[PDB]
Design a protein around this ligand. Sequence first.
Ligand code: FDE
Ligand code: FDE
Ligand code: CHD
Ligand code: CHD
Ligand code: CHD
Ligand code: CHD
Ligand code: FES
Ligand code: FES
Lengths: 359, 359
Amino acid sequence: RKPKTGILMLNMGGPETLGDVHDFLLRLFLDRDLMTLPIQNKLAPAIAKRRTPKIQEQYRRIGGGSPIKIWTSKQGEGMVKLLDELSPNTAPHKYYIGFRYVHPLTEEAIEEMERDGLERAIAFTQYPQYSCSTTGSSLNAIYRYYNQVGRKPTMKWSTIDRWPTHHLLIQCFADHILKELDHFPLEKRSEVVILFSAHSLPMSVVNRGDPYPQEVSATVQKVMERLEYCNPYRLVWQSKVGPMPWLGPQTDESIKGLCERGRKNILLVPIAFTSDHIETLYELDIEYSQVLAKECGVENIRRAESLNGNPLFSKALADLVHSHIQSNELCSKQLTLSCPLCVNPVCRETKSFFTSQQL
Amino acid sequence: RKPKTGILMLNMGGPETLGDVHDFLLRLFLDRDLMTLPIQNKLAPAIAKRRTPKIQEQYRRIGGGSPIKIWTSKQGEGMVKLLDELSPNTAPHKYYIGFRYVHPLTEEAIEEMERDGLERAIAFTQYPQYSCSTTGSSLNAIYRYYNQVGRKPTMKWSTIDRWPTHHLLIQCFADHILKELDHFPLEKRSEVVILFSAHSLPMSVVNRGDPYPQEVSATVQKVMERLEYCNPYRLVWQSKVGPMPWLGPQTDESIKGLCERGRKNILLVPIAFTSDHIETLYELDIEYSQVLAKECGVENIRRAESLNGNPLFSKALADLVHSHIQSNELCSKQLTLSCPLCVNPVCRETKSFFTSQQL
Ligand code: FDE
Ligand code: FDE
Ligand SMILES: C[C@H](CCC(=O)O)[C@H]1CC[C@H]2[C@@H]3[C@H](O)C[C@@H]4C[C@H](O)CC[C@]4(C)[C@H]3C[C@H](O)[C@]12C
Ligand SMILES: C[C@H](CCC(=O)O)[C@H]1CC[C@H]2[C@@H]3[C@H](O)C[C@@H]4C[C@H](O)CC[C@]4(C)[C@H]3C[C@H](O)[C@]12C
Ligand SMILES: C[C@H](CCC(=O)O)[C@H]1CC[C@H]2[C@@H]3[C@H](O)C[C@@H]4C[C@H](O)CC[C@]4(C)[C@H]3C[C@H](O)[C@]12C
Ligand SMILES: C[C@H](CCC(=O)O)[C@H]1CC[C@H]2[C@@H]3[C@H](O)C[C@@H]4C[C@H](O)CC[C@]4(C)[C@H]3C[C@H](O)[C@]12C
Ligand code: FES
Ligand code: FES
């Protein structure tokens, strides 16, 4: 039976092999929803070529590529299997991967969905917390695709554009934290400090009204409530690049600082992505946990497992899609308010693209 | 009957009359738990003198003084009345006001609690969200007081050091929001944008690990959940001082930005203080809602009522104290973790002062 409902899973993606690194960086530096540069068509390929060796070396250090596509596929398969049973009236469901910067690209996915002759398409961001740099850019890509192709969609669109507090997402995080706490020496368990770590944003983005830091904070509070405040925590921010101001405190500085202050038993929790990727596998596991932590005299540093293949996680995904379908919503109320200092003309067009959909 | 349990309500306070402005600012610029200045004992008097006229003029514009003490007293009286019935084994209860920068000073309150011959003293911060600049400074004052008099306390101490998501606090905010939405023209209600406004922090404080922005964000999310996401929102940060980087976006710029982008129906919600004070009555009500709003072409700008004398709020205070007593807690789990980059030696001493209490 040919698919009726398509679920477009949106994420930035990551290079699957070392050879994919250059083009990943090229698309990233070309993305005007992420950043603007002078002579950008000329300077993007230059930054790409320059930064490829360094990024290739990071991927080499974790086994030679990003597991993002593997994990997304596994999650998508599990989601669809559940959706066919939850929602027989919208079945068969099919998932499509729409990566922003690697194949399959958002635009390739839309093309395939349109060729597949779907009745309905759901833009399902894989970032639980909304940033204009992440979910916003992916949704802008969908608007721009139709705008540049010069045709209206042949399917009904809607979006699940954020889900920072979904009950089953919270349960998955709390489960993975509890199981990692079990791996500390018993005598250190109550002394463990939890560092929730989410990718940082430049202050220029924070200061224009980006919703992300507040939503990430909300996920943290729900997880800690579920854990009954069993250990103390901070929310800290990783992987700032370059010399400009970004939102801190930095995850690396925090680890060092805790160690210097006698807090030598630390649990890292990636709170803003749902699968392993370069920043858990390289940055947290290698750079912070193996190198820095050792230099600083840590006693025990561990990282909670990414959600990856947890069946409760694909259950959260299917629950979200099913509730979205049942509610008839086209997007969250939050999407209807652009950043107070948004200077990107496309964000309003994208918002309208979703709110104006037939149905 | 002589009081058994003292509830020390901690708040920065504000000058009750125009003549109180100078000493208020003197104490604030002298506070080493708030800020670090070279030759601070010498510089603080010069800073206070310079800024007194500007601050006096703000207070004149709102009727000549701060209502903080009035609202604190009312809230304290209602709390005590409830506590005498909720907790007869710790009754009679007495509230004491400990303002950081005006009379009655934290130190004067402690002196009076000790003279009153209490069995138990609860340091009850009136800031629901913990910052080291606010609650931390007030709790540090308590430790420093005993350190300076060179005497141990004659009463058992404990602290309610944060309460960002207390269910009755959330219900009060949501209630006041719904009440204010009812005052917009009916035809604009769904179009209203909610701007949660909390005092900003300097980025130097944010970047050392201050807990405040994440706890404020948690209060915001719980209110919006209770409101069923009826209107879109942002959390924005008010009244940065001086030229250094502070956490944004700023409330004033956001108001201007929203107006410029066609969002002309705005509800301001003070989310991080529980009574009116100079920044609601002057900054929000006059500077932003009267002057800025008019300049930008606003259609409707309103501000949700501060919690003030709401009886449900007194009930929240009493339920917090009651739970704290029943739990036997000495402080939150969060207080047992100092900021990862804390450089104030008193924070650890204060933390130990509470965690080490007999009982
Ligand atoms: C502006 C901005 C904003 C943002 C945001 C964000 C969020 C929320 C999350 C995120 C993430 C990320 N990133 Fe992000 N971001 C950005 C950016 C960027 C850049 C520029 C890059 C590249 C880096 C280098 O080193 O080159 C990135 C990058 C990034 C990454 C990595 C990728 C690879 O290498 O593979 C990740 C994972 N990012 N992110
Ligand atoms: C560093 C820092 C931090 C902080 C924080 C905070 C929070 C959380 C809250 C707050 C608040 C406040 N403040 Fe705050 N803060 C600060 C500061 C400050 C200063 C310097 C001042 C004074 C200003 C002037 O103008 O002079 C203030 C200030 C302030 C105020 C006012 C007072 C009067 O006038 O009365 C208020 C209400 N603060 N805050
Ligand atoms: C990084 C990740 C392992 C995650 C983990 O063990 O925690 C692994 C799992 C499967 C791996 C990939 C698959 O084994 C297939 C490829 C095998 C090649 O030898 C290298 C690239 C290659 C594309 C792999 C790169 C990387 O090692 C992957 C993506
Ligand atoms: C780190 C990299 C330097 C490339 C190189 O010379 O190797 C530079 C090139 C362009 C920079 C970005 C662009 O200037 C646009 C953004 C501007 C913000 O002020 C900081 C983040 C911001 C996203 C920058 C981060 C970083 O400094 C980048 C990515
Ligand atoms: C600003 C506040 C009113 C807040 C509001 O409008 O809700 C009012 C309420 C009661 C007022 C105070 C009281 O009326 C008593 C004093 C009267 C004097 O004429 C001025 C200072 C004085 C100490 C007042 C200052 C200020 O106008 C107060 C504090
Ligand atoms: C506003 C005032 C300037 C006095 C004047 O000339 O009017 C200055 C004097 C001391 C300053 C503060 C101190 O330098 C300490 C803090 C330093 C942080 O980087 C910013 C906030 C911070 C709290 C400063 C804010 C503001 O710039 C202050 C308060
Ligand atoms: S940058 Fe946030 S809506 Fe445009
Ligand atoms: S500055 Fe936060 S604990 Fe000392």
